[PDB]
Amino acid sequence: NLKPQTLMVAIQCVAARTRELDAQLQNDDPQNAAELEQLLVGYDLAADDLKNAYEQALGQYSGLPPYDRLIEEPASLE
Amino acid sequence: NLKPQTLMVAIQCVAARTRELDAQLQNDDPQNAAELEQLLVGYDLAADDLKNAYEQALGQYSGLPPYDRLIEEPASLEHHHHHH
């Protein structure tokens, strides 16, 4: 079983890549952006599966932050 | 449970973010390098755990790719040549 710290890092990294790829779509060649757009739906499906696993972890383990905190866009970027 | 597809995305996103942090550490004047290194320890630990989970996810005759293919450095596969 994956450790809760692992779930946290995965959640954070999938959220960060999703943001980074989204940010550049506007400038990207439309052909490329369209293909990324489809990859990014796949990222969101993965993100949902990770959330479900994390919610199970929140019922098992203490000392974990709320899900919405993990995926929050960092203040220094917004 | 995590689906195989979810594990692949997680593995590849952790690897991508790891590469981004490594590039920052290699550039001039990394700020808070010790702290970037702390983040990388956690990244590495998650990566190892995800690796183990991915191996667990594979059937005996899986179609899914080797783990090493998921984490390989993209630039390492590129070749670049101008026209003569």
Curated annotation (Swiss-Prot), chain A:
**Keywords of this protein's UniProt record, alphabetized?**
Disulfide bond
Superkingdom of this entry's organism? Bacteria
InterPro entries (UniProt xref): T6SS_Tsi2-like, Toxin_immunity_effector, Tsi2
Disruption effect?
Answer: Deletion of Tsi2 is lethal in the presence of Tse2.
Against Gene3D superfamilies, the record matches this protein to: 1.10.287.2500
One Pfam match: T6SS_Tsi2-like
How it assembles, according to the record, is: Forms a heterotetramer with Tse2 consisting of two Tse2 dimers and two Tsi2 dimers. Formation of the complex inactivates Tse2 enzymatic activity.
Primary role: Immunity protein that plays a role in preventing early activation of toxin Tse2. Binds to a large surface of Tse2 and thereby occludes the active site to specifically inhibits Tse2.
Its protein name is Immune protein Tsi2
Its source organism is Pseudomonas aeruginosa (strain ATCC 15692 / DSM 22644 / CIP 104116 / JCM 14847 / LMG 12228 / 1C / PRS 101 / PAO1)
The top of its lineage is: Bacteria, Pseudomonadati, Pseudomonadota, Gammaproteobacteria, Pseudomonadales
